[PDB]
Symmetry: D3
Subunit: 175 residues, 6 copies
C-alpha cells in the first residue's frame, strides 16, 4: 500500500514524495490516513485559494509536529493523488501555526524523471514569483478557518531542508 513506500532511494538528496493534493486543483485538502492508507477529505477550504504546487509527504519520517515531513513538488503537469514521485530537496519555508513551528519543503523532480529541474540546485534558484506565491498561500489559506492559523517566517536553503529530512527520518526509525 502507500504505507510501504520508502522515504527515498538515498536520503536526503534522493527522496520519494507521496502526493495528497495535485497542483492546479480544486480547494479540497486531502490527507492519507496512517491506519488505512486511504485518502481522506480533511477540509473543503473556505478560501478561494489553491495549493501552488503538488503537495504531500515523505513516508517513514516523523517531524516534531507528529506528522511526516510536508513537501511541495513543482511539476510540468499536475500529479495524481496517491501517486509517488522521486524528487530532490532544494529549500524550505519555515512558519508558525496554532500548534508550533512547521516547515514546508520544496523538492523538484529527480533528474531521472526529467532534466527540467536540474538547474534548480538551491533555494535561490527557485523563481521569485513561485516562492512569493507559496508564502502567500500558506499565510492566507486558513484565514477563514477558526482555530487554525499560520504566520510565515521565511525561506531557508537546501541544506536546511535536508537536515529536516534526516532528523525526521531518524526520529521515525527510532520511534
Amino acid at each position: 500500500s502507500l504505507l510501504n513506500v520508502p522515504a527515498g532511494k538515498d536520503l536526503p538528496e534522493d527522496i520519494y514524495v507521496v502526493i495528497e493534493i495535485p497542483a492546479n486543483a480544486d480547494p479540497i485538502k486531502y490527507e492519507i490516513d496512517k491506519e488505512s492508507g486511504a485518502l481522506f477529505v480533511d477540509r473543503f477550504m473556505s478560501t478561494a485559494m489553491f495549493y501552488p504546487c503538488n503537495y504531500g509527504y515523505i513516508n517513514h519520517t516523523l517531524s516534531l509536529d507528529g506528522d511526516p515531513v510536508d513537501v511541495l513538488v513543482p511539476t510540468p503537469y499536475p500529479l495524481q493523488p496517491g501517486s509517488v514521485t522521486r524528487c530532490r530537496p532544494v529549500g524550505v519555508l519555515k512558519m508558525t501555526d496554532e500548534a508550533g513551528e512547521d516547515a514546508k519543503l520544496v523538492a523538484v523532480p529527480h533528474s531521472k524523471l526529467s532534466k527540467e529541474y536540474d538547474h534548480i540546485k538551491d533555494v535561490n534558484d527557485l523563481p521569485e514569483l513561485l516562492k512569493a506565491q507559496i508564502a502567500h498561500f500558506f499565510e492566507h489559506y486558513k484565514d477563514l478557518e477558526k482555530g487554525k492559523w499560520v504566520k510565515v517566517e521565511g525561506w531557508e536553503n537546501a541544506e536546511a531542508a535536508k537536515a529536516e529530512i534526516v532528523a525526521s527520518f531518524e526520529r521515525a526509525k527510532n520511534k
Copy 2:
C-alpha cells in the same frame, strides 16, 4: 486499504463514505471490488447522464441487497474516486429495481470538513431541484441497459436514512 476504513466515527449521525464515482464526471460506473479493494469498471453507461452528486458506500455495512449501503454526497467540488469523506445523513430515496427494493441515501459533508451544509438538517432542507434531479437520474440512467431497471418510489427523512445505516451495520457485524 479501502477495505479497513470504518463505517463511521459515531454511526448513524457521523459516517464515512468511500467514493466510487465523482460528481460532474464522465458516465463510467466504477465499483470497489470486495476482494481486492481495487476500483473496477462496472459499466460504460449507454445514456447521456451523469451521477448528480459524488456516489459511493458505507464500509462495513450489509444491506438486504447483499451490498454495502449506497450514498450520494453533495460537495462544492468533485471528489477523487477511492477517497473517503466524513458525512452526516439527511435523507433517503427509495426505489425498486430488477432485484427488489433499494435505497440511495443522501449525506452531507460533516461540519468539521466545512460549515457549508450545516443548515441541511433533514430531507426537506435539500434543494427541491437537487432532489428532483437525483430521482430523475435513478429513474432513467438504466433505460438503455437490458436486464437492469429502476422505478423510483419516493423520498424519506433523515431518521429513515439513519435506520438503514444502523440496520445494515448490525447485519454486517453479525454476518
Copy 3:
C-alpha cells in the same frame, strides 16, 4: 458583437452580464476591450487565488471609475468567457482600491434560466461562506501586484446594488 448586447431586458431587476472570467478557473484575469470587443489578458495573477464566481460586467453602463458595472454571478457550472447571462441583482460588496471606491455586485441567474436561485432575494440570503470567500478574495488577490491594492469595506443590499446599476446606466446614456 459583445459591444451591442443590452444592459438588460428590464433594468435594474432583469439584467445581462457579459462574462469575462469563469468560475473555478485558472488565475488569468481577462477583460473585454472596449474598441474591438475582443477578450484580452489583463494579468497572469501572482497569487494562488481564483475568482469565486463567474465575473464580468453590465454592458452600456458607466460607473464613476470609468468602467462598466462589475458583477459576480454564481452558477451551478462555470460559464464560457464571452458568453452572456440573464441575471437578477441581490447585493453588492463595497471596497476601496488605489483609484478610489469600487463595488462588486452579486447577481443570480434569472428565474427563466433556472429556478435554482429564486430563493435568494437579498444579500442576507446569500450563503455566509460565499460572502466571506468573495470578500477575502478581493481583499487579497492583489497582495503581490505592486501598484494595485484593495481594502474591502462591506456588503450592502439588493436596493444598493440596483441603485448602482441605474446610476451607471443613466450615466452611460447621457455620456
Copy 4:
C-alpha cells in the same frame, strides 16, 4: 462575426455548423443571439444529462420552427462554443415538441478535416449505441422543465437530412 459565416461551401453535402454546446460538457444550454452574434445562456438544465455530441446550427437557414437548422456533430474531441466546423450530413432524428415538429440532424466532420468519419455514409452507418443515446437525450432532457416537452418520432436518412437543409436554405434566401 458568426452572423456572416456561410451555410456551407456546397450545400447540402458540404456544410458549416456553428457550434453552441460542446460534447462532454456541463449541462448549460447556450444559444447564439441573432441580433448580436453573442453566445447567451438559455438554460441551466435541471436534468443530469449532457448533449451527446457537439450541438449547433447551420447559418443562413430558416426552418418552419423559425430557427436555423439544428445539427449534432460527433467529433474525436469536444469543440469550442462559437467555433465553426465543416461537415457532411448523414441522418436526421425527427421529433415533436410543445411547438410542433422538429428535427435534429447528424453531420460528421468533412473528409478534409479528417478521414475518421468517411466510412459513415448514411444513417445506418452511425453506431446503434450513439443513435439510441441521442434519441434518449432528446426524449428526456426537458423532463423537469415545465412548458417544454419532446416526443421522439424516429430516424430518417441522409437524403431526408439534405432535404431539410435545402428547404431551409431556400426559405431563408427568400425571406
Copy 5:
C-alpha cells in the same frame, strides 16, 4: 491491493487490465510498483505526445522483458489511474526497443461493460487512423529521451495477442 487482481476471468479471451495512464492525459508516464502496489512517476515526457488510449498491464503475467503484458484499451471516456477494466484482446503491435522485442496489445472493453466494441473482433476491425496513431506514438514518444528508443515493426492479429497473454500467464505461474 492492485497486486491481487486476477489476470482475467477466462484468459486469454476475457482479461483484466490495470490502468496506469488514462487516455487524453498529460504526458506523465506512471507505473505501478511491484512491491508496494503504488503508482509511481516514471517519467515526465519530453515530447509533446500523449498516450492514444488508456494504457496498463495484465496482472499475474510475465513477458520475456521481465514485466507484465502491456495493453492499450480504447474507451469512450478516459479511465482512472489504478482502476481495472474487463476487456477482450483484438490485436498486437510488435516493436523493438533498446532492450529487445516488445509488444503492445490492444484490448477492447468487454461486452458486459458495453456493447460498443463488440463489432471489433480482430485487428482489421480497429480503425485505420487509430492503428496509425498508436504506431506513430510508440515510434516517436522516446525521441527526446537518451538511452531509450523504439522501432515499430508491425501489427499482428487477435490470435497473436492471445498467444502472448497465455505464454506470459504460464511463465508467471511457473516462475
Copy 6:
C-alpha cells in the same frame, strides 16, 4: 471583432498575439477565418501530439506565405481560443514545408501581464527542453497528413524574430 485588434502597441518589441489553439489542449487545429473573424476547425489531427504552447498570430501582418506571422506563447496556464495576449518576441524556429519556408516565433507574456518571463531576453534563455519539444512537434505533427510536411531547420534569435515581425507588418501595410 478579432479582425480589428492592433499588431501591437509598439512593434516589434511589444506585440499582440491572437490565440487560436491553447496550450495543453486536445489535438484540434483551429484557425481564425479572415473574412468572418470566426474560429474554424482546420483539422482534427491524426497524430497523438499537442501544441506545446498557446499558438496564434499577429494581426495586421503578412508573411511571404500569405498568412499573418505565426507565434507560440508560453504561459503559466492555458489561454482561451480567440483571446489576445500582449507579448515580447524572444526567438524564432525556422522550417521548410510543402509550400516553402516558414517560421514559428516564440513570444513571452509582456512584463505588464506578469514578471514571470522577464528573465527570458533572447533565444538562449528559453529552456532547452521547451525548444527541443517545440522543434520535435513541428517536425512530426504532420507525419500522418498526406500532402502536408515539415522539415525543421533551426532556431534564430530575438533580432531575427523582430525582423520577421517588422517585414511582415510593413508588407501588410503596403498591400
